Each structure stands twice: as structure tokens, then as C-alpha cells.
């Protein structure tokens, strides 16, 4: 898996759950996962989507994935693997 389009939406949601639950192997693995979330999504808010979300959507892995999916689609970017 290299870009977000290599992940199904389920796989990507399980990855956001991992981050949200701090379930990396170590603290530094969590940091790598957050940075990987940033790389994969290309969203300019980066880690703020996880930790400092806008207040007009749900603060949850669901909500984070919804925001990413909608943002990528609306901005002409590729999406999840079917």
C-alpha cells in the first residue's frame, strides 16, 4: 500500500481507528501513523482532522473518514480502492 487509493474505505477507517485509539506499537509508531495519515490524505489540515476537528461534524474515526472522503472527491483527487 502506497497511496490512499490502495486502501479500501474499511481499511482506511481501521487505520484511523488505530490512530484515534493510540494503538501503535510505540508512541513513535503513533507519530508515524499520524504523519502517514497526512501523507495519504493530502488534506491541508493534516493532524488537526484527528485532534482539533471543526465543530460542524462528528469527532470520531467515522467523522474523520467522512471529511477526507468528501474533501478528496470535491477537490478532484482519487479515492478509496473498491
Amino acid at each position: 500500500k502506497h497511496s490512499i487509493s490502495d486502501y479500501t474505505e474499511a481499511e482506511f477507517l481501521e487505520f484511523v481507528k488505530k490512530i484515534a485509539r493510540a494503538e501503535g506499537a510505540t508512541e513513535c509508531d503513533d507519530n508515524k501513523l499520524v504523519r502517514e495519515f497526512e501523507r495519504l490524505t493530502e488534506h491541508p489540515d493534516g493532524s488537526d482532522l484527528i485532534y482539533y476537528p471543526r465543530d460542524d461534524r462528528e469527532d470520531s474515526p467515522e467523522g474523520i473518514v467522512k471529511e477526507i472522503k468528501e474533501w478528496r472527491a470535491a477537490n478532484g483527487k482519487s479515492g478509496f480502492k473498491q
Binding site: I19, A20, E27, D30, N31, D45, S47, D48, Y51, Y52
Partner: protein
């Protein structure tokens, strides 16, 4: 190794906002109370205990969102706002104001920037 010492300072709901300011934030007095006179094998073990104590204190943790709560529950530092991050430094840090290693009156919570 060393024993944690010192008093820390009263803080408010948004105390991590001060970590972004030029002073930084102090170790909260309530945390200092919990860790004083405890022995730590390393500064990393002391750092773990600080964040675990933050996670257990409803007032110091109430402004952390659920993802950040998860992090401190494991004794990990919480992530800062994106605009306070630098390089791969994305979480609050514990700096010495400089001078003893476990002196909580000598330690400030800071953002990376």
C-alpha cells in the same frame, strides 16, 4: 535515576494553550502533588507518568478530544495543533528551563514551535 521534586503551579481549563506561548505552561500543581518524591529510572519514565497523570485528572484532560485522551491514557504526549508542529515533532514537549532533571519547578510544557 532520580526522585521528582517541586511544586508546579495552579492552571486553568485551557492550560495547554499556554504551552504555545512564550513562557510555555508549568507542570500543574496537582500533577506535582501526585509525582513528588516518586522515584524514576529515567526522564522518559517521568514523562510517561506526567501524561498518565494528565489522563487521570478530569480537569487537566477535559479540553483534549477523544483521540488525544487515548494518547495520554497510554502515557504518550498529546498532539499539538498542526500550526505548532515542526519536523516530526508533533506533540507537547517537556523542556528544562535550566538545574535538576526531575525538578518540576524547572520543567515547562511547550509546543514544538
Amino acid at each position: 535515576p532520580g526522585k521528582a521534586t517541586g511544586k508546579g503551579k495552579p492552571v486553568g481549563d485551557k492550560w495547554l494553550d499556554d504551552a504555545g506561548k512564550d513562557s510555555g505552561a508549568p507542570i500543574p500543581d496537582r500533577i506535582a502533588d501526585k509525582l513528588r518524591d516518586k522515584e524514576f529510572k529515567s526522564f522518559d519514565d517521568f514523562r510517561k507518568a506526567v501524561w498518565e497523570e494528565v489522563s487521570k485528572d478530569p480537569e487537566l484532560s477535559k479540553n483534549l478530544n477523544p483521540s488525544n485522551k487515548s494518547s495520554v491514557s497510554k502515557g504518550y504526549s498529546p498532539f499539538t495543533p498542526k500550526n505548532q508542529q515542526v519536523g516530526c515533532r508533533k506533540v507537547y514537549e517537556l523542556h528544562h528551563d535550566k538545574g535538576e532533571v526531575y525538578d518540576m519547578d524547572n520543567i515547562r510544557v511547550t509546543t514544538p514551535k
